[PDB]
Write a protein that binds this ligand. Structure first.
Ligand code: HEM
Ligand SMILES: [O-][O-]
Length: 153
């Protein structure tokens, strides 16, 4: 798990995100879709986005980025005590959305990239270590639910 000090770093970084949730959320999804175009195919409602300019111009993409980062923020504020919040997310992403755990790795990497990109020189080595640990915990607990369900892809 994470130490008290590590959770404090995580939630400090998260304050940066909360100042512009939609902007951060938009940039995370664009990083995901452009780096890994197969992920776009999981979203019927974003498949029409053929260029990054179209992605940037999509107000619905920003809306979805808000939904995604709001959910993640709720989970992070539980400091690992997130069974009730995480279980339904794991089950919807396995059973309904069919999202392999690989894609959660991709979006975790995207969050780290966007933090550096939006906050260059203000996302320190300790903060990166703590945020990475929190995202691995999130991913690892989803993975346990995926194994229960026998889900791979
Ligand atoms: C930080 C990780 C993620 C979080 C917190 C998250 C959260 C959410 C939430 C709250 C919803 C709406 C409620 C629901 O259907 O459960 C949702 C929907 C969805 N998610 Fe995620 N998600 C994450 C990662 C991903 C990834 C990596 C993909 C695909 C690569 C994905 C694909 C989808 C799709 C296809 C929907 C339905 C979209 C729609 O048509 O409205 N999610 N997600
Ligand atoms: O994408 O959630």
């Amino acid at each position: 798990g994470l130490s008290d000090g590590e959770w404090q770093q995580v939630l400090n970084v998260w304050g940066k995100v909360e100042a512009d949730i939609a902007g951060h959320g938009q940039e995370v999804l664009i990083r995901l879709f452009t780096g890994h175009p197969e992920t776009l195919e999981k979203f019927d409602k974003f498949k029409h986005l053929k260029t990054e300019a179209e992605m940037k111009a999509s107000e619905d993409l920003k809306k979805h980025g808000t939904v995604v980062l709001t959910a993640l923020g709720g989970i992070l504020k539980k400091k690992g005590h997130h069974e009730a919040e995480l279980k339904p997310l794991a089950q919807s992403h396995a059973t309904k959305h069919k999202i392999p755990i690989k894609y959660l790795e991709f979006i975790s990497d995207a969050i780290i990239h966007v933090l550096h990109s939006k906050h260059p020189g203000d996302f320190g080595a300790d903060a990166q270590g703590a945020m990475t640990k929190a995202l691995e915990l999130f991913r690892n607990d989803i993975a346990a639910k995926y194994k229960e369900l026998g889900f791979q892809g």
